[PDB]
Write a protein that binds this ligand. Structure first.
Ligand SMILES: O=c1[nH]c(S)nc2ccccc12
Ligand SMILES: O=c1[nH]c(S)nc2ccccc12
Ligand SMILES: O=c1[nH]c(S)nc2ccccc12
Lengths: 288, 288, 288
């Protein structure tokens, strides 16, 4: 919703339609250190958010800040390099905003990736984690990317989220992760979106655990509301870039932008995984 | 508080005093599918929120959006058909706003009803649930209908809420529910206000349970702050319109606007119950 | 962040530098009933927030609302009598605002005190509680005193908070509390910041307990983000002004502004403790 009207969104989609060859079927929104995946694109047309009629511009490089329309491995993708976070200041209905254009672009599946701090002890930096559910810690509070009036043009007043994350694709994903036989396990997990940008304290971590969450992070669960709200099929992963300290002790263990190949090998691990998974995305037309 | 001054509230009360025969003693605010209760009114004078000097207008029918002043079964009621939710966009101090007029109207008791998703497993669609306590999930965050400066004219800076929901009336209520010997049990329960409008995911439901809540819903706990803050006697019920899925499995069970007589029989069940309860509301004057 | 630019902060620091003899090393921000500690100051220069270029002014006495620059027991202090709360209406980046001036003033340690409702049953009104960690219940939601863009001039985009509260000083503190051999124990504890001003209901209290918190209160955990974000050394205490009712029963037990010497003896207890602790604050220069 707010700040944007439906025309804004059309205008934005329209400009993008009438400015690119591409009709993307799949949107991907990359988390930090996963932008690299925009390389896998072919016949990339890049846009600076900038140029796009309503798109939030980022907050300064920025140049981690682009929309690249692509072919990833089958599918007509549009990818977002440099997602918006509420910790940066927009509100949700600027985070969730590409998502609503993506739809209008005719996108029907959204994949989201992100980096999260693993809370689940069975979890190791480098791990990918396939999002099964989420906890919307800002949602509970007001902060849900649908707050204000509802545009029946996009969705229902009270979309369900019990099924945000596709059984089918989590199925397919989990298959695939084995089909290529791997490294460690493809984890699966509730991701807690915590806003807002200090990292947690121990007591806080402890809470997110007892609350039940496996990966804590800070994007997703707004793209996902606006996505499921729209009807997109959603799935995604968190790269565990950190084992979240659960526990009292000294100068210790964190974070994402400071591991060797446990940033950039894991990043590519997820990136290829994602690229492969394109193959499981149901082609659109009904299409068998 | 915000956006409204005390004069606004007087002006609104004043206009309503000087525009209606009625001096209501009791305000009732109905939840979805309980507006029907405004039928039980007699010598109904209806107002569109619309006409009333400051009242938030709703967000579009709207025509589920009225203030009907009534006699319910003893008492001089003013009832609200179409409560405001923060998921729609106002802030609390527009939800909580009728409540502060109601006081100024000389109302001294507020009854609130709503539809909530039952979290407590011992709970069944159709169930009424008498609110014993609440958890103010947006309150913890900022979002409390008293945030900003306090008008000692209405209440204290730091009202207590441990006693939001009258022992007396929960007593009386619970009596009465037996006095007419019933169907199922009159349940009792913490209602968690969760903002913000997608329904929860499973993980989320799980959290509200371990958090201790029985009914999850999305109004009340702002009317109740502003009410107790004002001194009104508050009590209320949730119609369980849903057994909240606690648990992983397929295309399943939800929601309120889609049960047969487990919408409209339960609605009337609560509505009569409410009408009867008028009888337990202490008449005002000290009055024995 | 928001609403303020970096110049504002300099201007404010600059005006205060160029308007006072003092260069404070330590900032102290007092909680209710601990303002008295500004008496221990010597060569007090008082400022009304008022006079200070950007400082939020309070919301009305107000006259519990001053910045007194002092010498407490060694150290060059600047103290804040009448902290801002978000329940009053500013946003965090007006609570957290003195803190950022304090830095710019060259302050490098911040001590925060407050009154909290004890949740931990092993806890008794009068108790001081040394803050070991916090739970940032509004932080999880959006409400973190760093939300919006980050000024690398003050800190990192993603400051850690696992170490908000100094091991060293909690060490020193805990030493000292024994060194003067005492009354009861110096407690230690997670403080939950809950926003937002009604007191909790029982169900709510129950939640903050299972969430793990010992003292619930309503300031600190924003000064602390902006402080650690800045690099200040932070530590502090909560005066337990209340044993938070955990439990269902009648007209019972609360609150802070209504105990005899379990307001004002405890206040002085904490105040001296604080004054003594000045002695443990590492002098600044590297300084051995
Ligand atoms: O290690 C982390 N803790 C938290 S709260 N959020 C994160 C987001 C991305 C990477 C790591 C983290
Ligand atoms: O079934 C429900 N889940 C949630 S979160 N809120 C509700 C509000 C009204 C009716 C049902 C529900
Ligand atoms: O007794 C209290 N409960 C809560 S929620 N907050 C407080 C803050 C200061 C003093 C007491 C309290």
């Amino acid at each position: 919703e707010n700040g944007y009207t439906y025309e804004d969104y059309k205008n934005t989609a329209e400009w993008l339609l009438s400015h690119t060859k591409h009709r993307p079927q799949v949107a991907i929104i990359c988390g930090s250190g996963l932008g690299g995946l925009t390389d896998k694109l072919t016949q990339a047309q890049i846009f600076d958010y900038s140029e796009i009629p309503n798109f939030p511009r980022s907050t300064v490089p920025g140049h981690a800040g682009r929309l690249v329309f692509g072919f990833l491995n089958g599918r007509a993708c549009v990818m977002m390099q440099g997602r918006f976070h509420m910790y940066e200041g927009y509100p949700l209905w600027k985070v969730t905003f590409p998502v609503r254009v993506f739809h209008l672009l005719g996108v029907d599946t959204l994949v989201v990736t992100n980096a999260a701090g693993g809370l689940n002890p069975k979890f190791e930096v480098g791990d990918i984690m396939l999002i099964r559910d989420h906890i919307n810690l800002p949602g509970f509070s007001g902060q849900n990317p649908l707050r204000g009036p509802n545009d029946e043009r996009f969705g229902d007043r009270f979309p369900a989220m019990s099924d945000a994350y596709d059984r089918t694709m989590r199925q397919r994903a989990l298959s695939t992760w084995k089909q290529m036989g791997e490294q460690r396990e493809l984890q699966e997990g509730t991701y807690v979106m915590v806003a807002g940008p200090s990292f947690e304290t121990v007591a806080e971590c402890r809470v997110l655990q007892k609350l039940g969450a496996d990966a804590v992070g800070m994007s997703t669960v707004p793209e996902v509301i606006v996505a499921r709200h729209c009807g997109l099929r959603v799935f995604g992963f968190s790269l565990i870039t950190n084992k979240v300290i659960m526990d009292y002790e000294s100068l210790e263990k964190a974070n994402h932008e400071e591991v060797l190949a446990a940033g950039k090998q894991a990043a590519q691990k997820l990136e290829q995984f994602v690229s492969i998974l394109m193959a499981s995305i149901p082609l659109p037309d009904k299409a068998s």
